[PDB]
Amino acid sequence: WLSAASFQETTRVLTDAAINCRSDKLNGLKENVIIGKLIPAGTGINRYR
Amino acid sequence: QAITRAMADQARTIRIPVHMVEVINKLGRIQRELLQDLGREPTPEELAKEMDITPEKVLEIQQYAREPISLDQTIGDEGDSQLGDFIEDSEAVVAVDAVSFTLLQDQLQSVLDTLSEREAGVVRLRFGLTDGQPRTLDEIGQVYGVTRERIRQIESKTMSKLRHPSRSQVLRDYL
Amino acid sequence: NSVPGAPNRVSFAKLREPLEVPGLLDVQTDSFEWLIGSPRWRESAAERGDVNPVGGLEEVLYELSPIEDFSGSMSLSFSDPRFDDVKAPVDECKDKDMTYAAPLFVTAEFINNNTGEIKSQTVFMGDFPMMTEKGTFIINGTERVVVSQLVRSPGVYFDETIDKSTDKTLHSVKVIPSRGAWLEFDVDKRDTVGVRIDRKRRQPVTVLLKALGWTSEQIVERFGFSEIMRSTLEKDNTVGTDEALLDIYRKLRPGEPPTKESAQTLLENLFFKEKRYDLARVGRYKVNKKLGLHVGEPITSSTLTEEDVVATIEYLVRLHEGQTTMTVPGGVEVPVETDDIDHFGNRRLRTVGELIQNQIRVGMSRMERVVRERMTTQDVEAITPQTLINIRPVVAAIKEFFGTSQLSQFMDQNNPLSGLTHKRRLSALGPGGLSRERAGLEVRDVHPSHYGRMCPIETPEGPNIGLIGSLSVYARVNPFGFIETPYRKVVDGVVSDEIVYLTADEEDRHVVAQANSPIDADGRFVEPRVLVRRKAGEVEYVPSSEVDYMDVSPRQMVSVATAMIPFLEHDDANRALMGANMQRQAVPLVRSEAPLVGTGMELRAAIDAGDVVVAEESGVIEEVSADYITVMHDNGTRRTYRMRKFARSNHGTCANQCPIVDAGDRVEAGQVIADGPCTDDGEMALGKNLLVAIMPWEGHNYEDAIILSNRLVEEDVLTSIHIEEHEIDARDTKLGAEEITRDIPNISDEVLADLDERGIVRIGAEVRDGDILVGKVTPKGETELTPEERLLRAIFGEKAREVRDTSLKVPHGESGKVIGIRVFSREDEDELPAGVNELVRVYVAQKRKISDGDKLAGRHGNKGVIGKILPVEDMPFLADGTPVDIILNTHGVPRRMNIGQILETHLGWCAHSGWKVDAAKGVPDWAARLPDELLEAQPNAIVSTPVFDGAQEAELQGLLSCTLPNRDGDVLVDADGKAMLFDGRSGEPFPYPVTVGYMYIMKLHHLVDDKIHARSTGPYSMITQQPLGGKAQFGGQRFGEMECWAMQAYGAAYTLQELLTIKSDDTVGRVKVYEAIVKGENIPEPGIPESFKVLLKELQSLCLNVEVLSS
Amino acid sequence: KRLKVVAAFQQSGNSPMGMVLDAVPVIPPELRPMVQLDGGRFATSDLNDLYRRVINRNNRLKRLIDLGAPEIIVNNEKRMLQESVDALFDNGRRGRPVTGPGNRPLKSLSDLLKGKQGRFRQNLLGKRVDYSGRSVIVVGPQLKLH
Amino acid sequence: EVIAEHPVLLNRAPTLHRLGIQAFEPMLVEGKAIQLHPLVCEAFNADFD
Amino acid sequence: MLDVNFFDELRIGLATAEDIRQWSYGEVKKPETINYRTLKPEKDGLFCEKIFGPTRDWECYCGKYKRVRFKGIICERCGVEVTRAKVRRERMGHIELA
DNA sequence: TGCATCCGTGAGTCGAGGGTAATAACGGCCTGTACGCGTCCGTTTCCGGCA
DNA sequence: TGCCGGAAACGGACGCGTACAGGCCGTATAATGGGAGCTGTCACGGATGCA
Ligand SMILES: [Mg+2]
Ligand SMILES: [Zn+2]
């Protein structure tokens, strides 16, 4: 839900993600950037990190 | 009465007393009437004379009467930037004086260690270095089993010693 | 000619012009004078419409007065506006930060109806801001100019649309007023002509007619051919005037219990009483022209009318029917056709007079409301007009218009051209005008009605492309606000000398000739077929008999700044646009020599810009100096003019004014008496003349990079003076009062060497980045100190020093001397803002040289930064050893379609060298049409090629053929215009000839010192903890979303984490990373961003439970 | 369409009773700072006005209720409170947007997230950074590629 | 000495594609203009106007 | 809660009245923001120190405690928890609608 | 069932930039807050004798 | 010269008498439903109300 909210139509995304009690997994690429953890691409994956 | 009282009480973001807002409106009315029947903007001394208060009181009232602004108005010619992003946060850490103070503490610990244990302990207890509360001569004497006169003699000799250039040439630039 | 001291600038113009360039500041001056009611405007209007000369203020007071109560038992009136002398002179206002204003006086009359009593009083309306000799306003010291606005005139506007489904035309009409409601009569997919009022679509025209009182028989009689309207009558399903009024009320007024008398007056209030529906004089005139109601009636009664409404409906139905002409019963016949909004017959120009009049009206409306409110509450027979009137709303409206309004722009002054072109500026965006987001591509186009009324070239190239324009040189503004254009009327092929001003409608009605039409030097046309612009903008060949109008002169369609571009007709349009827009950003140099080759619009542009002192009355120069000139008039009296030595312009540029007359010269009223910032001998000079090469040199002039000779640095050819000011106010505080003094806490005596006894620096004392300019101290108060600080203070014997140091320090990256210090005080009774006890201004000026990175540009938009400044020795030089000064690139010329620079270079070389046409055996054929005193010219002579009628290419070739030698027998430039250059670095001659000449280039206001910026650790934002932005504060660069995408795409993670966490937002991370860098340790791991924490708090505040979970 | 939200409510341990609001939360003051500028001029954060309106209308409703007022006045005050809370959560979503001085619409909590000026696209994805610079550029034909 | 062998990044707005960010080895120069290698102008879409 | 940057989920749910009043440290019941004269936050106002923490580092409202030694204690007279000034950034309040 | 109406969303990128409309005003009182000399702890000179 | 060992003012806690700051209450002819500013974007999707 975080990626969709940061992308577009934030009000409509939040009002339906909250109702669904949706829980993010922070496994994508925008979420790691938002929360300040290393992205899972390039030198951020476990193979190299 | 109710409408005036409520408007005075809740008209502004910064609350103003009823008498203060009353005198503010009185001063505004007086200024408007004076400008109308004079043709020239009057001086604060003239306002004070007409309202029968002091000019410093007039200036204080005028300063109080000002209302705040909003941190989200488009200040620029185009609308892409608010007012709040042009304001410095003075409460933040300078990020340079912090490391300067850390190294000052390190140097102070060194210059203290260049002396002996007795002097270092008494001066640290006296000025509250290891603890926030600075102890007094009576407390130091009670801790060390000697009198406050002996503590004062030690403090004086240590203060004289620390003013030598061999011990102040490193601490001079930290002020 | 026509200027007594005009330098002899020989011109290449082929054809004479009958009409001279009008006063370039007329659009401002005449407008404000009409607003005032000045005798000059009064006599002009008497010459051109003496029927009713009324000023803006007079019109406002007349349309306001009289003011009545609800009972109508007592009234008040206003009359006779009259101004007073200015309260302070212009220079004094600009210095002491006042506003250039003058008191306003009116004659208010209070009249009682029941008893009968008149009370005439002199009422002071307010301090009315005034417009100076140069057409600019001064508000709080600074100079401001209010730009004219382009808005669509109110009236009727018909259009047709295609439904693209049934493929039938759907006509419509919008009667758009000013200060009123809307109403549209469209044609639907079916045959029910809708009457949408205030965006409520229902209710065909039959109901509206019945509400107006028209019976079905009258409707059928007036509209018999209308099959659509007869069908609507058949399916009206509503009969009765009162029933129609009931329907009107329930539709337009939901939620209100309708009555039979409220509805009877609702329509009259909405569209017939002037209180709530007043289309302006322009709207009434436009409606009368479009329908043809009254052809001779003086314009009045600005409210709508039922005859106008029925005429509009009939116009719509006949337009749908497909007729060609219409005759209103009792009115002249008028053609029927669609109306275009982009046509300049409908886009009136709301100038400064009308803008200030509108603000005055909206203020006086509030004043009249207050008068009416207090007029009933206060007891009768005990009131006077002084008690009645409140002028605070009016003065507040004037002030709130002049300040904080995007139509009242900060008058940019980089040069007199910049000032002049900021005047005469037409901006389509503003209050009541279209915004950029709603600005479609349709309006950003050069409609064919712009010819002679607005420049198609000059306009901003950024996001405002097409929304901002400038008036043409010969353009004139109609009293209604339309833009006129002069023309010479031709009769039976005889081009007369009578000049008739036409607007868009008249120009479309008639047939115009071409400016460069080959007249026979007698009035006739040599060829029957001439170029012609038709009504729809069509360009055709027409026999000379049908032509009935002709342009006054070539270059009429162009504006001033673009008319200053030589060889314009050879340039493209985009590069001409760039050159015109970048001619206004040139900085004033220290010498400002006149250009070699130019147009005839430099002398007029300079002397009409107001930045050149000109003797008003003829006489003999008595005393001349660097500060003042005393002209001894022909009759006894003398007059002294004060120059402006090193005055700061609004954009930090020098504004010197050097006299150009000696102690015994005689000057005639109108002669230039003193140069300006960018002037030379009276005419205009935005740059210098520099030797030019068109060869690519070792990749330093690569991709619009520019190479400069060091001679410009050595001799200060391109060296500008920039003046910056600093303001610091010692103000009252809660804990005490700040004072300006030498005694600054925790400071040494080294930095105090340059400070005088009272705290401020010395005049002429140079300053460097980080110095002390004004020593100000603030009461610090009571604050707990660290134990280490206490120990240090005890060790060194220094006291607490309970006040804090906040002194005016010159910011990062500034240097230069100090010119003057202006210090205000409360003790000497100066007008200071409340709470400020001491104010002081320090002026710092630096002599900036030319350097790499500085922006240079010619007059054809061939811009470019300075790549490298070579020494004099290693630059190409001609056969005689003269080195070139600048080195352009050849690749940039052809693909930008601006060979106008090449032609200018050739003509400049010809002008600099000097030529002589050898007419030993007759005048050569190529120079047959060349004017006299042009076959031979002295070296370094100036020429003047006009915009659209100038030097031809054959004439350029002929001039280049004869290029009389410099000092020895040597023609350094061959016939082609090239030369043999020697490589000053290696030594061997260049294997092929290279074009050389004297181009005119200017130093732009995009200097490196204003752009270079850096940051390591500075101030931080308040709500979020990110660094600030911009060079004004310290600020850091913005790492945008696209940069983040590139960072991610690079396979990169750690750099992104660093730039997003321990560089911007990690509050407990920035200090740790700084400490680690200082001590030489590894960079610690980052933390979560404070911005993310703020987002989490905001989400929790929006009643959205957000919890971060570990497992 | 209905079963979408119905099943969304049903499948979780979530209750639809929370959709109606009984206790509005207050954002921490630091995120809506009241800063004093140079010269004693203050500058609000435009959320304080909305919160003040909410508090004033709630208190006035309490006073009317415990004093005893006609249903017309009580319902009008309740609608006042409802509209004020709606403006606080999303200004301009319904009806005329609430505006302060200068006819400038106020900024609500949802305006801090919507659009390009929202928190996400303005500070969460792209931020001003330290150790940065900016200057004009010239050609360096004598330099190497690296 | 402290700048020798310390790569820096150059950015140009807009950053259309991946090659809008590149890393170079800095060298101190006079003036106040960031000298740019002529061969990266294509990648950066940067002219010297 | 402590944000040690070891996260695996970010759950957004429909907050309830109990959740809001559990988040809130106190209830604001007066529409004052700042005192016009002393420039100190008003009691129970939109900036109340008692609810949202102290404006100054380790300094209560009446000054009875002004040093690090009194850390984590509650001023029995003023009602302000004496702690770091940054705390005013993380505490929330709630309004009990009538 | 189709049709119109309406609503809502998004529509660039880098500097240059910081302060505003609109009136009963007093008596009586009252409790609270403050705050200006004096004697105490304590710290910067004092001065009498002195080594 | 510096040190020793107290001695001289410059400053934290105050009853007290006073200043004023702020708040509450109450005013008596009669007056009894708003100003008001808007409505020059364009494509898309979708929900709603009614023929
Ligand atoms: Mg470019
Ligand atoms: Zn306390």
Swiss-Prot record, chain A:
Superkingdom field: Bacteria
Induction conditions: 6-fold repressed by starvation.
Coiled-coil regions, chain positions: none
Family: Belongs to the RNA polymerase beta' chain family.
Subunit description: The RNAP catalytic core consists of 2 alpha, 1 beta, 1 beta' and 1 omega subunit. When a sigma factor is associated with the core the holoenzyme is formed, which can initiate transcription.
Function: DNA-dependent RNA polymerase catalyzes the transcription of DNA into RNA using the four ribonucleoside triphosphates as substrates.
Name recorded for this polypeptide: DNA-directed RNA polymerase subunit beta'
Organism: Mycobacterium tuberculosis (strain ATCC 25618 / H37Rv)
Shown residues within the full chain: 1220 to 1268 of 1316
Curated annotation (Swiss-Prot), chain C:
Effect of residue 422 to L: In strain: SP28; rifampicin-resistant
Effect of residue 408 to T: In strain: vr3; rifampicin-resistant
Enzyme class name: transferase
Pfam families in UniProt: RNA_pol_Rpb2_1 (PF04563), RNA_pol_Rpb2_2 (PF04561), RNA_pol_Rpb2_3 (PF04565), RNA_pol_Rpb2_45 (PF10385), RNA_pol_Rpb2_6 (PF00562), RNA_pol_Rpb2_7 (PF04560)
Reactions listed under catalytic activity: RNA(n) + a ribonucleoside 5'-triphosphate = RNA(n+1) + diphosphate
Annotated consequence of substituting residue 422 to P: In strain: vr8; rifampicin-resistant
One GO cellular component term noted in the UniProt record for this chain: plasma membrane
The enzyme's E.C. designation: 2.7.7.6
Effect ascribed to mutating residue 422 to R: In strain: vr7; rifampicin-resistant
Effect of substituting residue 118 to A: Weakens interaction with TRCF and CarD
GO biological process, one term: DNA-templated transcription
Matching HAMAP family: RNApol_bact_RpoB
Biological function: DNA-dependent RNA polymerase catalyzes the transcription of DNA into RNA using the four ribonucleoside triphosphates as substrates.
Family label: Belongs to the RNA polymerase beta chain family.
Subunit: The RNAP catalytic core consists of 2 alpha, 1 beta, 1 beta' and 1 omega subunit. When a sigma factor is associated with the core the holoenzyme is formed, which can initiate transcription. Interacts with CarD, TRCF (Mfd) and RbpA.
Protein name, as recorded: DNA-directed RNA polymerase subunit beta
Gene: rpoB
